[PDB]
Amino acid sequence: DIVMTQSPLSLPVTPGEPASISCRSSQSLLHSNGYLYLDWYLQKPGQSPQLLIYLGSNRASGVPDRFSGSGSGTDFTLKISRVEAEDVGVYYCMQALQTPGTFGQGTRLEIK
Amino acid sequence: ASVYAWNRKRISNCVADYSVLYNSASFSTFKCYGVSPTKLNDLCFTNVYADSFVIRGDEVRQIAPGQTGKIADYNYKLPDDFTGCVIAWNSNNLDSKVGGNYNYLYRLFRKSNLKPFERDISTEIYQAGSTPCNGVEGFNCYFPLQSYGFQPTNGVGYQPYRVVVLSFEATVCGPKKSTNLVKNKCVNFNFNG
Amino acid sequence: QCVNLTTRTQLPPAYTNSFTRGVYYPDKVFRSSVLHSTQDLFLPFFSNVTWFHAIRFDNPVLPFNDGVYFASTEKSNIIRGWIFGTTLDSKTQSLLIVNNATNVVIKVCEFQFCNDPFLGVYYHKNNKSWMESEFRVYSSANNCTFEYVSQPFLKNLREFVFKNIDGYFKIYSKHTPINLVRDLPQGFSALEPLVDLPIGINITRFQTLLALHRSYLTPGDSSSGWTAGAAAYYVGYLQPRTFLLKYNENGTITDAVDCALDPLSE
Amino acid sequence: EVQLVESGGGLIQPGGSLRLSCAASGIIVSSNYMTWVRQAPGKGLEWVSVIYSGGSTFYADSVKGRFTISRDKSKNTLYLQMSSLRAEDTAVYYCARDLGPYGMDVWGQGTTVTVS
Amino acid sequence: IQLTQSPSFLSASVGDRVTITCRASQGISSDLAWYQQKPGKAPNLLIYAASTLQSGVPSRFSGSGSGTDFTLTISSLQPEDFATYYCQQLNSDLYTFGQGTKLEIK
Amino acid sequence: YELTQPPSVSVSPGQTATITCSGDKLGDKYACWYQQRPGQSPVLVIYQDSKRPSGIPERFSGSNSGNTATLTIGGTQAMDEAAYFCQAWDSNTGVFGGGTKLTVL
Amino acid sequence: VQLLESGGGVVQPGGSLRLSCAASGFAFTTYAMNWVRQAPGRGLEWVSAISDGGGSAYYADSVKGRFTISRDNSKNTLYLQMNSLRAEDTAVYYCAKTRGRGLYDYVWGSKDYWGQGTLVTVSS
Amino acid sequence: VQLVESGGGLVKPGGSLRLSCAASEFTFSSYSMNWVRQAPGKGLEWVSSISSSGSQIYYADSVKGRFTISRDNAKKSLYLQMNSLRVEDTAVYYCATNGGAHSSTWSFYGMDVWGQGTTVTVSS
């Protein structure tokens, strides 16, 4: 199993400020073919998640430009350029390398 | 089936009734490049290939000896020496779905061109320009297969079209509505020649 | 598979005498009490036919010159079929005839025949009359056109004539219960055709298929206990000759004379 | 990263000969659908030609019999044989890459062609 | 096929909700690409397949419609959102465009 | 389908050993037996419930009837101390027995 | 694109259920699918995934044997077999499609589009 | 034939391996292969089996959907794809020939030629 831990557990950040969310893998998620198989999700309150960051550093269709991912091997960080009022909710990471698919425990970016 | 993975049936050592086809009056296309359709049921052919698939109305043009476009050069190619009958018909009431019929697909992004009668089933990440993805769906790394949007709202040129291409090659002959035989009378007959 | 068994047995050919043998109905036509003179491919009277027996069973590829006459005493179902072809490899279509116990299977594929094709036979203790045949004939069999199935062709003497004329493969057969000791009998019998397969391939060589048992297994040889039962089959060769066939009142060929056999027959 | 650069147009007498060039960096021309697109002054975009990834060619009704599209695999470049030039050929031409359901994702800067 | 945009000259102030219509005469239902062209510049994809946001386009741009009707919807205008907006027939043989709608920050 | 073998049995050297193998209607099936001396890859010693492979002395006698498969070793010696796996095939499935360990004193 | 999940409700401890993920607006013929559960206030946790044409039936330990999945490639629907349900599967279930359609885009990996979810409650 | 295996090594649970069993002679073609794993503390387990032609492939109940046996009679090699290597897969694997050409004749033979086993270890 790949047990992944997020850091930190909560990030209440005022809108307009920047925010970084880090989630480190127990094993190495690098180079199944040359990429970093960690994916980032946002579950906004009351509705279903969709992809924010795929392959560690890249994002899917239509994502706000403020989101960006970084890190290699075991450490990975999400980089929000400017927190706003629509960014509230839990953030998940997932290892996408081995069949047992494990998500994070959930850190909300909220407005304090 | 879809035009990329077109079905091909070998028909040999059976008895063929070509009258049902030529005299059905439900086909949008009946163009024979070998022997005329009305004179097709007396020529003993060897193998009869049945290439069945669904395309669009504008894509029926590409099903012709020596054509170009998506279907001709990337899906199904009809040879310039095709000696058979292309049989097409609209299927807007059968293979079209309200919202698009994505069950049917077609290969668009293929490296080179297609060979006469070749099934294109290369379903692997297609690098368009020069971006190595090593098997990743992305920019200049899209999937060569592309879906269809068959809908009743689609126009004739975008509507679904079932096309069975009959290729031909001493096992299947006929015809003359064989007149029932008579007995005990000195008669004039034609017994298989 | 392709377990090979032709280790070193290289005996000289043995010749027996096909006395008055291998006359088929070379036509499509009923005939009353009449002596008809036919000019077709026939096996000459009193000719030397190569004889193969268990000794086991060299079973070599033999020429299919213009058509062969095949006989077999084979009091148990040991002779099973033939693998006629041009190269007996891929890239060339070849014909495979096999019958299990209740059906005959005919195929024309680009087979990958083994160098010693045969069918292993096994008897399960639950139901002894099982005959679990395993194929050791080809390794690959793909991309083929013709495929025929029917009721099987086959001390219960069996006689076959094969010939390949104008794309048609013709099989003439006669099944006779015999009491003679070892070789072909004397009584005249006429071979009447079974099928006429529109194969259309070129055939220049052929090889019979044998039913071998596993008598003992040494751990690594794969070629240890392949005993060949007890059977004997003969191979003649058809030559273009003129015969004079006596048709019965009912239309059956009861008798014949070979021409250029001896002056009296002439 | 993906850049198309064009050259070859210019003021040319009516009915004369000319040729355009379109060098490509990043995209391989020899395996993608490249189109020629025209824009007359005071008018919008309009299609001219497309050469398939396999090498099959296509031109418009207003183009057949006059222009020819051509390529080079060594220089990764796209060409257009310009000939029998009438007054209506005065336009700016861009090279674009055709992906079917995906739109003209990359474009060229454009070159002005004038007929006089 | 003939594509008609409606209407040609269009004007609004910043923050207005705009709906630029390219009307399909036959009905094709998935083959639209939205081409925004800065005056005298190189066009760019906005919405491909007539409903999906092409990558890097800001989230204020939306597309809608399928079949015979099609529209371009801008949720909140910007002073730089003036351009000439094209509609194109995807999956076609002549790649027919529209005449062009010139939005104006007015 | 399972084959049941006693965990282990032992006899003095020079005696006759008897090791059983139980299965549901196992006398209707073909059973193979193997010898695994410790630290060694196994070797086939009995197959088809009655036949004895080449290279094996005749004192390896096996029989099958009913729901029990049995192997008999007369004149047991020192190197008969090995793991003995009764094998059988049912519905194309290789299922091995428990494996009875034979100990000689 | 719509991912309509059907079925679901109150089922009995140890009873049975079957869930339907009716998908539309996309191929689904060359796309993989995923099943994701979320017990109340306990986080997204994985269940299942399937290949383009079935056969590849990939499960977690807690659903070993007890859950099985299937798809209707003609009707474009996803299914989910349930047996002997325990109290830890009381959750809302998301069917989600993989990004994409090539190999090394793992059929148990990225999940681009998600559904609306239906609650499955095991109680009495 | 003379059989040698390779590929067993240290991997963590869920990882991937690909064992092998190479033959000396070309008599390999006539042998239906079997994969048998030996536990570090127990006897043997049948893993999979393949026909002489390779068209009759069977797996144990505990391993289907994970392993992929394949062979190459012209390459005189036997492989075993080893995916989702999971907690109890640590063992020593034996490649053993049957002799029977097809699965219908396997009961008439036994596994006679075993190569030197290869040790596979899965652990965190």
Residue numbers in the entry:
A (entry chain Z): 1 to 112
B (entry chain C): 348 to 516, 522 to 545
C (entry chain A): 14 to 68, 78 to 176, 187 to 298
D (entry chain D): 1 to 116
E (entry chain E): 2 to 107
F (entry chain L): 2 to 106
G (entry chain a), H (entry chain H): 2 to 125
What does the study report here?
SARS-CoV-2 variants could induce immune escape by mutations on the receptor-binding domain (RBD) and N-terminal domain (NTD). 501Y.V2 is associated with multiple S mutations, which could be divided into two main subsets, one is clustered in NTD (L18F, D80A, D215G, 242–244Δ, and R246I), and the other is clustered in RBD (K417N, E484K, and N501Y). Combined with the antibodies that we previously identified from convalescents, a total of 831 anti-Spike antibodies were identified from enriched antigen-specific memory B cell clonotypes, and 86 potent SARS-CoV-2 NAbs were selected to test their neutralization ability against circulating mutants, including 501Y.V2. Among 86 potent NAbs identified by high-throughput single-cell VDJ sequencing of peripheral blood mononuclear cells from vaccinees and convalescents, near half anti-RBD NAbs showed major neutralization reductions against the K417N/E484K/N501Y mutation combination, with E484K being the dominant cause.
On the other hand, all 6 anti-NTD NAbs have lost the neutralization ability against 501Y.V2 carrying 242–244Δ, suggesting that the epitopes inducing neutralization on the NTD are much less diverse than those on the RBD, which is consistent with previous observation of NTD supersite. Importantly, residues 242–244 belong to part of a strand that precedes the N5 loop, and therefore deletion of these residues would drastically alter the conformation of N5. Since N5 is involved in interacting with all the NTD NAbs characterized to date, the 501Y.V2 would inevitably evade most NTD-elicited antibody responses. The NTD-targeting NAbs aim at a common region on NTD and can be easily escaped by the SARS-CoV-2 variants containing the 242–244Δ mutation, such as 501Y.V2, since deletion of these residues would disrupt the structural integrity of this antigenic supersite. BD-508, BD-236, BD-629, BD-604, and BD-515 are class 1 NAbs and displayed a similar RBD-binding pose. BD-629 is susceptible to the change of Lys417, since Lys417 interacts with Gly100 and Asp101 in CDRH3.19 BD-604 is also slightly affected by the K417N mutation.
